[PDB]
Design a protein around this ligand. Sequence first.
Ligand SMILES: [Mg+2]
Lengths: 100, 105, 224, 217, 49, 79
Amino acid sequence: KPLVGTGMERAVAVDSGVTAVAKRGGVVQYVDASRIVIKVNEDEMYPGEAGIDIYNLTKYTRSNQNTCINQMPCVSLGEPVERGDVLADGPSTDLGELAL
Amino acid sequence: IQAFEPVLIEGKAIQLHPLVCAAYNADFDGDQMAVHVPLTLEAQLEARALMMSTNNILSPANGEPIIVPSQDVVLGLYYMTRDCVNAKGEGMVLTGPKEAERLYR
Amino acid sequence: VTEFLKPRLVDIEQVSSTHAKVTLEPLERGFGHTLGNALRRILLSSMPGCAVTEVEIDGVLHEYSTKEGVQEDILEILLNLKGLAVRVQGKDEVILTLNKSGIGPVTAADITHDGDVEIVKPQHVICHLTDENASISMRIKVQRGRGYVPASTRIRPIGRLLVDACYSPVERIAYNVEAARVEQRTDLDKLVIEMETNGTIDPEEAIRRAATILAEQLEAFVDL
Amino acid sequence: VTEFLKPRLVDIEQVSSTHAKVTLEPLERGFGHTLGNALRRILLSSMPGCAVTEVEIDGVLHEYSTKEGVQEDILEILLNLKGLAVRVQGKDEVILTLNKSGIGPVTAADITHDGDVEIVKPQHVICHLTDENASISMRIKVQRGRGYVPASTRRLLVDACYSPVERIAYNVEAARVEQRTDLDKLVIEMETNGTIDPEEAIRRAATILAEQLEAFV
Amino acid sequence: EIKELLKLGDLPTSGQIRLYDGRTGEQFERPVTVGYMYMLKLNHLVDDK
Amino acid sequence: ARVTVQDAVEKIGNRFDLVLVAARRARQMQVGGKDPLVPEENDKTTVIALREIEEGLINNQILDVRERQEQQEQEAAEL
RNA sequence: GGAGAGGUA
Ligand SMILES: [Mg+2]
């Protein structure tokens, strides 16, 4: 992280597509370097077709400039999460804020 | 463009004697340079006797030198040849510059 | 006159587990800076370390892959392992082994240590297993070296992973000079050396090592 | 892991006897700065040596005066005396007389021999005389010492310059023993006042420094 | 406010502190400015050129 | 080592023909089976020829004299 | 090999 930001960091980070941002708050049911699964919050859940949220992570893949890109989880088991919060740090990011 | 003698280095960047930078108007902000080698003997002699850096010291446009200590050495020298009104070890007498150096050291 | 008081090691204040202090006294005028700078350079320069060199994990082929069950990349594991701290008594090279199963963190304590290899930071974390039926086994290689050695410049199967070597215990060295309280004399100096190592070295041993190193190096100039 | 490049060769360049340029190589990376610096400080900071201490003039009791029949001024002759170079044996401090008259450059040979005390530079001028009928007599007290005390620290008095060296410098530079070209090479230029050869001064300084840390082996 | 925040720490409010040379070991006169800066490594690698 | 050419130019105050005469001498030396006139110090032929020029024992005129003399010797060596 | 786009000093 940059010690002295201008506060516009989280906006840029989340608005970009690199990081995996939760869509409906929930709880980490199981984490792995490759994927994540969230038991959805009771209320956010739709009446029919409950299911549970799941994410897969793009591992090392060449960028347009020959720079590898991959994502790393930034949470542990049993961690409650909220809608729109970051889950997987992408390149040059730290806890869902830009860090070059 | 100027000739030089080479000195090998375990790097991947062409070192350059700083004084000539003014002549090349070359900043170190990522400017690149190109290297050529003279093959035949006459080329080598031309280089040594005409294009060696030590032979080009006055701009052809005018007799003014072209190896002016550019920006940093000048600061050092100016700072050196100053004088505080009352500094440590004032008013004494010395028997030559060597004593001055020893005293300062 | 024409004689100089020989300094002696007076005290070693082990102010913390790693932070330590040493005192040298007496010292003739002007020598404090000389010796302090010299010893600082020597200590920061060369000291025998025992950093880890190679790794061999069971079910992986290259550091850029992942392993199921573990929630960190192989590169992260290697990076964390690089900062390990340990001492070895007799041998110049040893092979440690780590096996672990179940869920939770993996401290350094989880190593099947022998009586000659001694960890200094048992609680050093490595990785977090996130599945009960997910285990990891690995063989670690520890060598005895000095200074820095990148993996690029050294000198076999496809399972060996190579890290960079940083054989150096010390991290920060400072010192001060100050007047002593000798029976009757002024301008008599006393040196205090503050050090902070990673904890795998005896300060006194380090000082004696540096001093003998310096003396042995200096002895060339005499009797040219 | 306890082996280090001891320098070889130890070569020398001999400019005029009171000036030498020793070249030592190849030393382990970084040791050049530490070795050269320490020796420098030891040489030019602490060194046994006796130098003139004070003076008294027969006809002058104050520095802000002038004698006649002498070409120069009090301060000039004082500087000359500061530039003096003598060596003495077990006799710690000595006093010497410089009575002399007649026009001429009064150089160092004009002082009484006083036995063991030895003047290293007889040619060293001290003053000059302008009237042949003029005279000059003076008593100079020399005393032993180590460092360098200015006048302010304390019947005329002069600063003491015990150290015999005059100039030292060095410039570490790269070298290679057939590989591992990240190695250094020390080049010490030294110029003494002549009271001893540079090569011997280096040995003295090395002796002092190496001996100081004896208690750590 | 920067001054006040600094004074919250025990750092000199002037911002400039004294330093000491690596080789010689002696102090630098003229207290010097030091701190922390965020820096990037750009995509113009020497090996590429 | 060679750092300047000022003395050679003093011996030959044109700075162009200097190159040609030095080149001819060094060509005699390198491919031609000739020997130097100054003790070399593990230095290349060009600098050696330049130093010869510097000491003045070799200039264009002396070179012409020597080439003509050796030509006459060769013309006298056929018989 | 030639076009077009972008980029550095
Ligand atoms: Mg530029």
